[PDB]
Ligand binder design. Structure first.
Ligand SMILES: Nc1ncnc2c1ncn2[C@@H]1O[C@H](COP(=O)(O)OP(=O)(O)CP(=O)(O)O)[C@@H](O)[C@H]1O
Length: 436
């Protein structure tokens, strides 16, 4: 029972579901014997023979949705053999996050390689409201070519845009976007989250992120009838130098990077933090810069209060030769517009990975001061003279950032989201001015 694994169009090896349920992968000699070859994941480097590591399982399990519901659907959708990472992927394992492609050992490929199917304005709304039909990742039933897969827990979908048209890829056509819908859970301790308007909030956050010289993905708000969904330009997808072929970008996150399961994704649950990930960024290609933009992303998160910035929300492109480097900062949301007399106080918002405090780690966003950010870099051998610069710029830039954004907002954008965010971002920013 195999599952041929390709990377773009070259063969890497084959995943196989054992007779007891275990998962084993083995790199094809063709892939192994090539000066320009890279591993499936930094949790399983190139090697001859079979591989059994709990890693060869976790890797693929992270390649599936983080929501029971979604997986509850993925099954009934295509009648999966089971709920294990394999049998599920056998179904929608085609276009997934990164450049990995899983094809059933026996149903071999014919048909034009890269084929899709344009979508009518009135049909797109379907793909966007597929949950109403009990469908996973928005994959219309009529067809059957739809076999995408995406991580996360939010009701989303991924499509292929050609020129000025929304197309549902076919066979193994790489999707170019990730249209996420305003439904699902978020985090903090013991408590999940329902906030403002997913799209607006996220959008806003990305706008500030970008306006704040922060590297994030290209995304715009869209509307298919009465469906306000957000579509982000996948940063693991790229066309040939002249738009001839649409290639993928081998990528993986920080949970697979360490061979860790999906469960242990939250530091509080035994996951990695600013210390385990940084100590790992010292081996990154552009390590000097990757270590910098990271730390800076912490302040930003602390400033816009992003309580769901766990280990599964950070990745690294797998560069040829097994080398790696940090990717853009995807998935950005503020918990500020959820505060107030809604029984949730700012003293309750905690961060995913804590900072070097006086005693262990400090998370409550309502308690983190400059000293905590420095003590963090101090401990992690991150030049202090470089952190002060970060806390600095923020003190001088944020005030204007929250403004330049207000002027570049949609018409129908919740005037109140901005209110609950720019107020808190400003209260926190204050702790900065008072030092820098
Ligand atoms: N613009 C982009 N380009 C490439 N990959 C992206 C991306 N945006 C998100 N991803 C990838 O897809 C995964 C899930 O997307 P996202 O983080 O937006 O989901 P969610 O918002 O569904 C997550 P959760 O609710 O579980 O915190 C990420 O872990 C990342 O690997």
């Amino acid at each position: 029972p195999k599952l041929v694994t390709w990377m773009n169009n070259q063969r890497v090896g084959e995943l196989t579901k054992l007779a007891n349920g275990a998962h084993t992968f083995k790199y094809a000699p063709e892939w192994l014997a090539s000066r320009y070859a890279r591993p499936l994941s930094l949790s399983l480097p190139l090697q001859r023979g079979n591989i059994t590591s709990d890693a060869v399982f976790n890797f693929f399990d992270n390649l599936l949705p983080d929501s029971p519901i979604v997986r509850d659907r993925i099954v009934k959708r295509y009648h999966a053999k089971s709920r294990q990472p394999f049998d599920l992927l056998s179904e929608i394992g085609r276009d997934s996050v990164g450049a990995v492609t899983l094809i059933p050992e026996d149903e071999t490929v014919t048909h034009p390689i890269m084929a899709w199917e344009k979508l009518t304005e009135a049909r797109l709304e379907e793909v966007l409201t597929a949950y109403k039909a009990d469908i996973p990742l928005g994959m219309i039933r009529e067809e059957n070519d739809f076999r995408i897969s995406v991580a996360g827990a939010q009701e989303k979908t991924a499509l292929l845009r050609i020129g000025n048209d929304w197309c549902i890829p076919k066979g193994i056509t790489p999707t170019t976007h990730i249209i996420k819908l305003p439904i699902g859970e978020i985090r903090q301790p013991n408590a999940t989250l329902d906030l403002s308007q997913s799209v607006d909030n996220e959008y806003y956050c990305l706008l500030l992120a970008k306006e704040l010289g922060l590297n994030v993905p290209d995304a715009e708000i869209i509307k298919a009838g009465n469906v306000r969904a957000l579509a982000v330009e996948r940063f693991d997808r790229r066309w040939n130098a002249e738009r001839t072929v649409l290639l993928r970008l081998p990528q993986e996150d920080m949970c697979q990077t360490f061979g860790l399961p999906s469960s242990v994704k939250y530091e509080s649950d035994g996951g990695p933090g600013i210390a385990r990930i940084m100590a790992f960024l010292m081996g990154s290609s552009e390590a000097l810069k990757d270590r910098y933009d990271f730390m800076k992303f912490q302040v930003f998160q602390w400033l816009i209060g992003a309580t769901q910035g766990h280990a599964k929300n950070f990745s690294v492109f797998i560069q040829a030769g097994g080398s790696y480097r940090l990717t853009p900062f995807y998935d950005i949301i503020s918990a500020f517009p959820v505060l107030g007399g809604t029984g949730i106080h700012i003293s309750d918002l905690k961060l995913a990975m804590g900072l070097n405090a006086s005693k262990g780690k400090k998370t409550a966003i309502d308690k983190i001061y400059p000293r905590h950010f420095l003590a963090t870099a101090k401990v992690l051998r991150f030049p202090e003279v470089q952190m002060h610069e970060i806390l600095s710029d923020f003190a001088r830039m944020i005030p204007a950032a929250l403004d330049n954004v207000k002027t570049s907002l949609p018409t129908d954008f919740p005037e109140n989201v901005v209110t609950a965010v720019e107020s808190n971002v400003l209260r926190l920013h204050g702790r900065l001015s008072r030092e820098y």
